[PDB]
Ligand SMILES: O=P(O)(O)OC[C@H]1O[C@H](n2cnc3nc(O)ncc32)[C@H](O)[C@@H]1O
């Protein structure tokens with residue numbers, strides 16, 4: 001794991017300089033394509049991309065897991081919805097599925113801890129049947145967190161061997177906005193009230209309880225903010241850990257990862273805490289409608305491209321942004337040159 | 342023309358209600374897809390769409406024209422760049438071209454007033470060789486403005502007959518951000534300084550002059566803000582008029598139009614002034630990096646989906662947003678239903 005982390009490559013400044021120059025020579029006023037130009041340059045510096053902005057195969061990895069904290073009344077969806085939706089993922093009827101197909105991306109459903117019988121068709125990496133209830137203790141052990149990080153990391157880089165060049169992260173887990181809020185609070189130093197949202201339509205009444213639960217989790221566990229693994233293990237969840245693992249894996253692999261919404265931001269904070277070298281590989285997608293979104297993003301210093309007021313999760317926003325990544329590549333490779341004004 | 346305007350259909354509330362209900366029944370927490378849901382409903386109310394959110398063929402219409410105001414030193418690009426770029430449009434090497442191909446949209450290049458010999462391959466609807474210099478008088482006559490509105494309007498609806506269901510608007514015209522700023526100032530009641538930007542990399546030094554030119558145009562022409570045609574004809578340009586015409590045509594046709602950037606916002610203000618019935622057919626794309634963008638958008642009460650810091654024009658932002666429109670349709674038609682949680 002420390003090996004893994006040690007080997008995350010730095011971005012290729014040489015390739016980025018060449019990219020910048022090329023972009024500057026295209027048939028348009030310099031810098032006129034704004035963020036599309038920056039994105040192209042960013043991609044060029046990613047070693048797994050072979051010195052140029054390009055997109056081969058695309059994959060969205062959905063990490064599914066249950067949380068003991070559901071027992072605290074923090075989620076309106078019944079627990080079984082995780083298991084149900086995960087099965088649905090195999091039939092292509094969910095929101096991510098539909099958006100991924102539209103982007104020509106393949107969806108990988110990964111069970112890292114659903115509290116139900118295994119689902120055929122789903123990738124099995126289950127830690128346990130739901131994680132511990134963070135309101136009364138840790139979600140899992142450090143060992144457990146590290147093992148999963150490792151396993152997902154590897155799974156991720158292996159896909160690279162198969163032509164995938166662009167990943168998207170997603171999750172599925174009733175009550176997951178709760179641990180996500182706790183992590184955000186911890187990493188950013190914000191008070192719980194500021195980052196706790198309505199999740200999947202939690203009634204406004206029910207909010208207070210959610211806030212208290214978050215505070216409780218933190219007080220009880222005393223997660224160390226300087227230790228991303230410590231935080232994940234104490235007040236995170238298997239799904240969150242899994243997302244962090246995709247990020248570490250893609251970075252080690254020298255490839256880009258598209259973030260999704262709120263849950264993904266929490267995982268990104270942990271990943272960057274654990275390995276700052278991860279940062280350059282992350283690409284924001286959309287601006288989640290979850291309350292703590294702004295705070296979370298400010299800490300990652302990211303400005304999403306899409307303002308859609310989305311709050312579904314599943315990696316749906318990631319899929320929706322894929323065409324943008326492809327657009328930056330198209331611009332780079334297909335535009336004519338000034339020299340030929 | 343008044344006929345044309347009179348016949349713009351109202352949105353189909355019946356179809357929209359059915360759409361809303363269907364969306365609500367999809368396999369996700371209600372309202373979880375935010376703006377994608379709203380967009381789908383909007384599309385459903387458009388009569389040319391046959392009661393459902395759908396996308397058939399896509400077209401981006403680029404209106405090209407020269408402006409006499411270029412003589413005032415308000416643009417750094419040489420005048421010929423309009424003619425050059427317009428030819429380039431026929432070869433698929435420009436920014437819009439590349440982005441449109443990526444979206445599976447076809448680009449229609451329309452010459453409404455380039456100050457050069459006709460370009461083979463370009464649609465000929467030329468009013469004159471560049472419009473009058475707004476700093477010393479009107480851009481054109483009212484008659485001229487109305488005629489062009491009519492002609493473009495018709496051209497637009499005719500494309501509908503050929504399977505196009507979604508339009509994008511764009512332009513090409515050195516110095517065009519100048520008349521665009523004047524229109525914005527006029528319609529919104531903002532002072533020139535607040536809405537005059539750098540256009541295609543105008544040096545910061547050169548700004549003052551640009552502001553004065555705008556003020557001059559207005560003082561001299563005294564455009565009536567309550568009369569959109571009056572404004573267009575006095576302080577607009579052939580390209581701007583042409584964009585307004587696509588908007589009027591698509592609306593009459595009962596079809597959606599994707600806006601682009603700053604120039605497009607100015608044209609939209611005029612269109613809505615002329616015919617408020619046009620409003621429901623307009624769809625924002627991106628948030629232009631031009632200074633007066635925010636003001637312009639506030640007046641249209643539109644919040645763009647994409648924050649890319651783009652400022653190229655040509656209809657490039659419109660093309661980039663097409664996949665989003667298609668995503669809303671995919672969501673609508675392909676997601677599974679709750680009833681089948
Ligand atoms: O913390 P809560 O309020 O439960 O919200 C987080 C969950 O809701 C999101 N979520 C995604 N697809 C969903 N499908 C259903 O049916 N419910 C929630 C869904 C997210 O992915 C988590 O599973």
Ligand SMILES: O=P(O)(O)OC[C@H]1O[C@H](n2cnc3nc(O)ncc32)[C@H](O)[C@@H]1O
Pocket residue numbers: 027028029341415416417418422426512513514515516517518519539540541542543653654655
């Ligand atoms: O008012 P200015 O500073 O001239 O900016 C508006 C123009 O610049 C934009 N524009 C688009 N493609 C371009 N290609 C070149 O080469 N220059 C400007 C271009 C816009 O479409 C207008 O033609």
Ligand SMILES: O=C(O)c1cccnc1
Pocket residue numbers: 177198199200260261262263264288289290310311312313314
């Ligand atoms: O931003 C998200 O991804 C999100 C917000 C609420 C519920 N589920 C997911």
Ligand SMILES: O=C(O)c1cccnc1
Pocket residue numbers: 518539540541601602603604605629630631651652653654655
């Ligand atoms: O917003 C635009 O479309 C734009 C801004 C500057 C120059 N050309 C186009």
